[PDB]
Design a protein around this ligand. Structure first.
Ligand SMILES: O=C(Cc1cccc(Cl)c1)Nc1cnc2ccccn12
Ligand SMILES: O=C(Cc1cccc(Cl)c1)Nc1cnc2ccccn12
Ligand SMILES: [Cl-]
Lengths: 305, 297
């Protein structure tokens, strides 16, 4: 029993965090085998950021300009290349703590653990989701660039995010581990703003199924809805459209509780209309959208209360 | 910017988790040096049940390697299993008993394999609102101060309301609980007042000031108000502990108390604070200072 925002154990990722310094800038890098991955803006000054020409800034650098530190040991840089917005630093020592890993690009609505680091040293771990507007509502201070987001389903670490910047609203933007940004963002100091955000509908439904699994049914009703009528209502509350893929993905949770997806959709419509009326669902007075259908199945029991 | 429920990096603790089996029961153990610590209910008078067990009855598994038990003893509600191999991944550690209101990270494990990490607080009623399933017994609670892991909790049981109960690493329970199948219930809980105030300061630091007002209060007037809403009494120690956050924001502790009094009597009125429609009490003043400063381990 119970329902918490749960992160993956961070140990496999802690053993990969290093400090990367270039000139005056210091940020974090991910050391996997003999390569250290870090944001390419490590080669920039604050002035450069307005309109940086990364190719021009990089051609002026040599291997010995990049200082890499793993614990209290200096790593020697023997090569460098740029892949999109990530800098790949070839080092002379392979990381003996390199875990089984994959680089994965996630879609909005997906969740992951973030290991926030400063000076190549881990300070905290938290769970978050890729918002529909491609930003993340993280907790980051200056020096956190290069911190990574990951999942550890089984014993393989899937790296999905690398931190690059904070937007004016306090939200965060970054890339996958191949250097491609999530969203229409650039690693440039230009007028950039997060688009209007929406609620991840399939995630709120998953969390309502988790509440039913944990014994709470107060929010259910005798009504059903068509997928189209649900979406016409959902759009009015800034909820993402629910697709037939989302309905299929919620199938197992629907079978475990005996509540059809479109009947759970009718309950969500009613909650949006009425509010909670002094009640909570899983210790929350708001509708939670940062637990996916897969996280609910992983955390919750296979036996409904 | 941003304010999240943040746990300590769990790596130093992951390297200590083992699986303990005795008869039909399988739960988790904490392997530090040549001793494995686990709940004494794995053997289920515990001395009479224990005297009937031999070293070879306890099967300990560290990864895919079987550890050999060479001795056993009981300390309160924890079983200490002496093993022939010292854990090479043993970190610098202390066993600490925490007070209600204090927070810690829990590394939830099943079959000696860590599956998740989350942050939580020791409630005033000595229970924890955790997330555990059958097989989670032996999962531990910890804090990290510099390079030293402070183990403060070991999971033993789930109460009928879905809340959790356990011991410190010396086997002493938090709360009036016993490790047996008997009618046990969590007492009425209260809100950790010093923690809600710390979280209000964290909201101000992150640019949320709508709840601030021109008013101040006395500790005595506020404590009458707090007692009416099932909030823990605020002591002068709590006021002193909130000093740094008060200086950083320019909001006196009793100035922030008048804001909390207004939120308690009037509600939020369709507004949220740090993305929450409820007043959050699971961030201590030290947690707020640490997250809004970037302390590393
Ligand atoms: O935003 C930047 C620098 C920067 C400026 C413009 C573009 C790029 Cl790619 C990077 N650093 C940063 C990351 N996260 C935080 C949190 C707080 C303060 C600063 N943070
Ligand atoms: O509570 C017990 C069994 C038990 C019975 C009587 C005494 C003692 Cl100490 C333990 N196990 C348990 C722990 N956490 C959970 C979560 C869910 C279900 C079961 N859980
Ligand atoms: Cl995805």
């Amino acid at each position: 029993s119970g329902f918490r925002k749960m992160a993956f154990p961070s140990g496999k990722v802690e053993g990969c965090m290093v400090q990367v310094t270039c000139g005056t800038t210091t940020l974090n890098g991910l050391w996997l085998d003999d390569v250290v991955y870090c944001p390419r803006h490590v080669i920039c000054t604050s002035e450069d950021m307005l309109n940086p020409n990364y190719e021009d800034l990089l051609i002026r650098k040599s291997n010995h300009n990049f200082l890499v530190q793993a614990g209290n040991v200096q790593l020697r840089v023997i090569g460098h290349s740029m892949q999109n917005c990530v800098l790949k630093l070839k080092v002379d020592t392979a990381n003996p703590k390199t875990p089984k890993y994959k680089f994965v690009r996630i879609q909005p609505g997906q969740t992951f653990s973030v290991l926030a680091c400063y000076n190549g040293s881990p300070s905290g771990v938290y769970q978050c989701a890729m918002r529909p507007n491609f930003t993340i509502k993280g907790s980051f201070l200056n020096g956190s660039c290069g911190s990574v987001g990951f999942n550890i389903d089984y014993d393989c670490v899937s790296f999905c995010y690398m931190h690059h910047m904070e937007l004016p609203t306090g939200v965060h933007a970054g890339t996958d581990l191949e250097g491609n940004f999530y969203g229409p963002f650039v690693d440039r100091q230009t007028a950039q703003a997060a688009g209007t955000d929406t609620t991840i509908t399939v995630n709120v439904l998953a969390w309502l199924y988790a509440a039913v699994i944990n014994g709470d049914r107060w929010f259910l009703n005798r009504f059903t809805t068509t997928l189209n009528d649900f979406n016409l209502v959902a759009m009015k509350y800034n909820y993402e459209p629910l697709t037939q893929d989302h309905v299929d993905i919620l199938g197992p949770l629907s079978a475990q509780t005996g509540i059809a997806v479109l009947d759970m959709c009718a309950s969500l419509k009613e909650l949006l209309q009425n509010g909670m009326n002094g009640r909570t669902i899983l210790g929350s007075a708001l509708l939670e959208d940062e637990f996916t259908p897969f996280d609910v199945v992983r955390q919750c029991s296979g036996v409904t209360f």
